[PDB]
Design a protein around this ligand. Sequence first.
Ligand code: 8XI
Ligand code: 8XI
Length: 580
Amino acid sequence: KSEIAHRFNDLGEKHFKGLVLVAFSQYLQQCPFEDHVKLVNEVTEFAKKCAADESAENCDKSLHTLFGDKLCTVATLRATYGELADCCEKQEPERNECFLTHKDDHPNLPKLKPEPDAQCAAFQEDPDKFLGKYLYEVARRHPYFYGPELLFHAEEYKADFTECCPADDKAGCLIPKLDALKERILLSSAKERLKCSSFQNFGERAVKAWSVARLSQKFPKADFAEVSKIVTDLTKVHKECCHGDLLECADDRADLAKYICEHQDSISGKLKACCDKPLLQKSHCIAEVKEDDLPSDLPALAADFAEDKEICKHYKDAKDVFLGTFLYEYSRRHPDYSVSLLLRIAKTYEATLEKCCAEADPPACYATVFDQFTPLVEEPKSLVKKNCDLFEEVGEYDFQNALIVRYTKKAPQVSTPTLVEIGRTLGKVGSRCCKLPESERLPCSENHLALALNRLCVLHEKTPVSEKITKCCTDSLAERRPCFSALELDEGYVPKEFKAETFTFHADICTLPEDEKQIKKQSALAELVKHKPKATKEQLKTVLGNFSAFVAKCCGAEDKEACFAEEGPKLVASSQLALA
Ligand SMILES: N[C@@H](C(=O)N[C@@H]1C(=O)N2C(C(=O)O)=C(Cl)CS[C@H]12)c1ccccc1
Ligand SMILES: N[C@@H](C(=O)N[C@@H]1C(=O)N2C(C(=O)O)=C(Cl)CS[C@H]12)c1ccccc1
C-alpha cells in the first residue's frame, strides 16, 4: 500500500535515513549539509507517519513522486540549479529522467582533506552528524556511487576515527587509513560508474552479458541456471541504484545477499567467509568475493560448441540462450581472461555461427571456431606484457608520463587536467596489476583499463571535443579498449600555439606535496606534446628530465625566485629546439 512505509519497515530508520541522504546529495550536489539533512528528516517523518497509518493522505504515492516533490521545494532552485527547476514542471517519470541528465560527473569540489585535528573534534561531538556529513560529501562528489556500498564505507570511515581519535599521534594513525579509504572510494565509484554507463549507453542486455561473464568466472561451480538467476537479480539491483532508486536498490540487494548465502553450497565455497557476517559487510564481501577453484568435471567444450551437427539448429531456435550458455561455459574456465576479452570472444563465436550457418555445409565451417580465438587472446596479453615490462623498468612516475604522452597524441583536443588524470590513473593500474601472479595480470589490467576509459568517456559526454573519442566511447562496450589502443596521432591536429607562460615555473611549486609537484610537471609534459605532437617519446622524456632538474635546482636555491626567473626562459626556448 505505502511504498515509503514498506522501505522504511524493510530497511530500518538508520539505513533508510542514510540512503535518503545519499540519494539527495547525489541529485542536488550543491546545497549545504544541513539543508539536505532537513529534507531527509522531513521525508523520514513522513515515512513514520505512513508506517503507522498507510491509508494516511499522500502515503500511497510513489517514492519518486515523494522525493521529486521534496527536491522541488528546495530554497533557490533556479539560482543554484537553473536547468533543474525546469525538471520540477514535469510529472513522473519524465521528472526523474530530467533530474538524472542533470547529475554532474565532475563537480570539481574542494578536495577532501584529512584534518585529524578539527574532524576528530566534530566526531567526539556528535558521531551521527559526522557520518552524515561524510555520506553527503561523497555522494555529491560521485553522484552514481553504489548507494548501499557508501553506507558500508561510512562504517569504515567511522571505525577509523574511533581507533585514531584516542591515539597519541592523530594524523599518525589516521592519514594512511583515510588515504587507503580514498583509493577504495575512487575504485568503487569507478566500478559503479561503468555499470550505470553500460545501462545508459548500451542497455540492460550489455549489463547482463558483462555479469554472466564475470559471475561465471567467480562461481565456476554454480550451474547456468543459478548464474542466470543471480545475474537477473543483480542487474535489477544496479538498474535501480543507477536510476537513483536507492531504497529499492538496497532492499533488493539484501534479498540477493540472503539468497546467495542460503545457496552458498551450490554457488561457491569462497562464500562462507562472507555469509558469517553482518548485513552491509556480508554484501560487501559477496560483491568482492574472489574466484572459486575450478571443478574437476568442467565439460570439454568442443563437443557441444564445435563438433555437434545440430549447432545451427540450436543457434536458430534460441540464440540468446545458446550464446549465454557458451558465455557461461567459456568464462567459468577462464578466470585468466578479462571480462571484455570474454565478451569479444562470445561475439566472434556468434559471428562465426552467423557466417557458417548460412553456407552449404556448416559443420565443416564452424569446426575450427575455437581456433579463431587465438589472436583475440594474444593481442591483449602482449599489450599487458609490454606495459608491465615498461612499468617494471621505469617505475610509476615515468610510466604515467609515457601514458600521458601516448593519450595526448591520440586525443590532443582533451583538456590537460583530463589527460594527466587519465595517464596517472592508468599508471596506477600498472602498480596495482603488474605485481600480481602472471595469470592475474591480464584480467586485472584490462578490467581496470575499462574503468579509466569509461571515466574518459563520461567526461567526454559532458564536454565533447573529439570525434575519434566519441566513436570509441559509443560504438561497443567490449571493443572500447582495442578501439582506444588503435588510436594514433590525430594527423590533422594543428599544434597548439606556443605560450611561454604555460612552461614558466615559480617558487610556489617548491612547497607543494610530491604528487602535486608531479601533476605540475605532467601537465607541462602534456602541453609539450600539444605544441609538438610529432616529438618522439624519447625527446619528451629528455626535455622533461631538463624541467625537473631545473625545478629541483631552483627549489634548493638561496633565492628560489631569481633562479626560476634567470634560468626559466633559457630552458623554455631551448626545449623547443630539442622537440623538433
Ligand atoms: N548510525 C547511522 C548514522 O551514523 N547516520 C548518520 C546520522 O545520524 N545521519 C543522519 C542524521 O540523523 O542526521 C542522517 Cl540525515 C542520515 S544517516 C547520518 C548510520 C547510517 C548508515 C550507515 C552507518 C551508520
Ligand atoms: N547479437 C549480439 C549483439 O547484439 N551484441 C551487441 C554488442 O555489441 N553488444 C555488446 C557490447 O556493446 O559490447 C555486448 Cl556487451 C553484448 S550484446 C550487444 C550478441 C552478442 C553476445 C550476446 C548476445 C547478443
